[PDB]
């Protein structure tokens with residue numbers, strides 16, 4: 001049956017982690033709060049049984065995720081704190097993000113206020129700017145892997161579909177996985193690069209401001225059809241400045257979209273209010289951003 005250890009030992013680093021509260025599954029992984037027995041620090045452990053990694057192609061995908069994520073360090077990227085293995089499991093040690101993800105926020109709040117959307121989108125963009133400048137395309141940016149720490153700071157996570165651009169002008173021809181907010185050039189199998197991440201942020205912005213994703217249908221294949229045909233509409237109550245930026249990012253032609261470095265210079269950010277921080281209450285109650293308290 002094979003059972004997960006209660007204490008996880010890294011023989012190289014000599015660090016031991018006591019397995020705590022179950023957090024949920026993430027793909028092939030069962031995830032847990034894990035705490036270092038010496039420093040008492042808490043991390044999110046991702047635990048993958050090798051019995052699900054029998055195919056070299058699976059191991060290579062798991063290897064590449066680790067290889068990419070371990071190379072990154074940024075305020076808006078999930079912290080990578082180690083990985084190790086025994087004969088039965090791969091153990092990955094990640095930054096624990098105690099407020100889960102924007103997916104759980106979205107399920108509770110639906111459409112956010114515009115300043116909340118600017119706030120989160122700014123941090124998503126800063127993290128993605130960092131990725132692209134280090135030649136990493138994430139390829140799976142979605143509400144569920146945009147994690148939130150205690151301070152409601154965004155941490156981009158789940159590098160399971162990410163890839164490294166190895167040379168200038170390289171077009172990736174293959175994406176082995178099913179991303180949520182999939183760019184049309186991936187779907188049409190015509191070669192893709194960094195612009196797919198800007199498509200996805202486009203979709204995240206729409207979802208954050210509208211309360212639902214732009215191309216949703218009752219069948220994934222019908223969704224793909226719509227994406228390829230660029231069949232979406234922005235509700236009339238969305239402000240023209242926001243709607244303009246969504247439109248720019250959601251263009252069929254990847255070369256037409258803004259690049260990650262242009263986004264924060266958009267009128268959407270520069271001429272609107274961006275809170276310095278959000279109160280914890282924003283997880284459940286719309287903020288009014290009032291100037292003083294009564």
Ligand SMILES: CC[C@@H]1C(=O)N(C)c2cnc(Nc3ccc(C(=O)NC4CCN(C)CC4)cc3OC)nc2N1C1CCCC1
Nearest residue numbers: 022023024025026031044046078094095096097098157158
């Ligand atoms: C490690 C994988 C991925 C990741 O990459 N990081 C960095 C991550 C960082 N932080 C967290 N944090 C929490 C995630 C879930 C919960 C939570 O409360 N889960 C409840 C458990 C019982 N269940 C009935 C209802 C859900 C609490 C978290 O922090 C206190 N999760 C992360 N995940 C997730 C772990 C499962 C899917 C993805």
Ligand SMILES: [Zn+2]
Nearest residue numbers: 057175176177
């Ligand atoms: Zn494959």
